């Protein structure tokens, strides 16, 4: 009995912790995609700004 109770508790813990892990994972991909896009456009903007500055000179 004691072992079965402990195992059931552990299983419930598995379900809830795995669910949160799946959520965190989805959040990872979303955050990563936004971060990459932001860095790409930031590098693009910096290169264009340096070039237009050279052209201004």
């Amino acid at each position: 009995e004691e072992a079965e109770k402990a195992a059931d508790e552990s299983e419930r813990g598995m379900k809830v912790i795995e669910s949160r892990a799946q959520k965190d994972e989805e959040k990872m991909e979303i955050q990563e995609i936004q971060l990459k896009e932001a860095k790409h456009i930031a590098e693009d903007a910096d290169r264009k700004y340096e070039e237009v500055a050279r052209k201004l000179v």
Partner: protein
């Protein structure tokens, strides 16, 4: 700005409330309280299309009325109503010549301020002096006191 502000005022109250909500969504967490090139590009990515930076600048320049380089609510309405092209389908060259002739009733080659004012008087709507001055400036480029045919052609952009 003309057709843009016209369409803006043509919006309904519920539409303008949705526009304010969408503005709050776009400036959600911003640092200037308005939609700049950064925030506009972020919204474009959130949608899917990618906008050129010079294009973002030219667009913000085609919607602002203040001079901030960013899009506020008053400019949010313009940026969210400019879709329909009101100034398209330009009148035929013969129709444009007719317009210039009937605005130049005394047959001289110039639409003096008197003709423009009598025309505004004839239209029937309550003509405000500010409206007269703004239209006179919009037409008469060199500000010589009359709208020639080239200045009159310039008067047809944003008009339909």
């Amino acid at each position: 700005d003309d057709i843009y502000k016209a369409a803006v005022e043509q919006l309904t109250e519920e539409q303008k409330n949705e526009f304010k909500a969408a503005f709050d969504i776009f400036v959600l967490g911003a640092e200037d309280g308005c939609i700049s090139t950064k925030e506009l590009g972020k919204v474009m990515r959130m949608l899917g299309q990618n906008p050129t930076p010079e294009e973002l600048q030219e667009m913000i320049d085609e919607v602002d009325e203040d001079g901030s380089g960013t899009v506020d609510f008053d400019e949010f309405l313009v940026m969210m109503v400019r879709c329909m092209k009101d100034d398209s389908k330009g009148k035929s060259e013969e129709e444009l010549s007719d317009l210039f002739r009937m605005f130049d009733k005394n047959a001289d080659g110039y639409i003096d301020l008197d003709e423009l004012k009598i025309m505004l008087q004839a239209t029937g709507e309550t003509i405000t002096e500010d409206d007269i001055e703004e239209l006179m400036k919009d037409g008469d480029k060199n500000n010589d006191g009359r709208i020639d045919y080239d200045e009159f052609l310039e008067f047809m952009k944003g008009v339909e």
